[PDB]
């Protein structure tokens, strides 16, 4: 039930999503090992993901969380990179999309920095890089990220390196 | 998947060393995220 709607680059919505993508690039402590060496992106397309069942699933849970947290869902817009982005847009997030070995346990991880999520597009640690050239810093191959609406509710604060 | 810490719905990973890093977040229920936008891009080679 998923349809993808292209946003025009003239659309204020395209422009605000592109700005969040570009403005949250940072340098990484791996010198670009996982995600590549870059300061900015060439945005090729931004599509709205429309699925009524997946949206209702989201809003149902959001209401449950809000009601447990003084009517505050603590909703953020956050990036997610994964080799399974095609599966996610069609079937939704679930336990198959969890990072079992993540620093904060087996859950689904999201980043404020788009460049952090970019490190996961080709797998954990960038995997072996792009499928065509096996290059984690490939400047040719098209990459995809998700910019996601995320309900945090009451969030446990972990200070960490 | 693991469970959220008791009394919580997510975990926030606050950076404590790299002053320029932004936060990362973890949810333990797939229903707590909706994939709103699919962004197709290339990384650019610095000049
Ligand atoms: O965007 C992120 N994706 C991922 C990510 C990590 C792992 C995976 N998988 C997908 C299921 C197969 C095993 C590993 C998918 C996404 N981890 C992050 C960690 C910190 C901040 C952001 C991310
Ligand atoms: Zn490539």
Author numbering:
A (entry chain A): 952 to 1112
B (entry chain I): 1115 to 1161
Please give the exact wording used by the authors of the publication that reports this structure:
Two homologous tankyrases, TNKS1/ARTD5/PARP5a and TNKS2/ARTD6/PARP5b, catalyze a post-translational modification, poly-ADP-ribosylation, of target proteins. Tankyrases are enzymes (EC 2.4.2.30), which belong to a family of proteins known as human Diphtheria toxin-like ADP-ribosyltransferases. Tankyrases control β-catenin phosphorylation through regulation of the stability of destruction complex by ADP-ribosylating Axin and therefore inhibition of tankyrases offers an attractive strategy for treating cancers with increased Wnt-signaling. Tankyrase inhibitors interact with the NAD+ binding groove of the catalytic domain and they bind either to the nicotinamide subsite, the adenosine subsite or span across both sites.
In particular, increasing the size of the para-substituent improved the potency in compounds 29, 30, and 31, all characterized by an additional ring, as well as in compounds 32, 33, and 34, having a branched side chain. This increase in potency is caused by the hydrophobic interactions between the para-substituent and the side chain of Phe1035, Tyr1050 and Ile1075. The most potent compounds were those characterized by a substitution in the para-position of the C-ring.
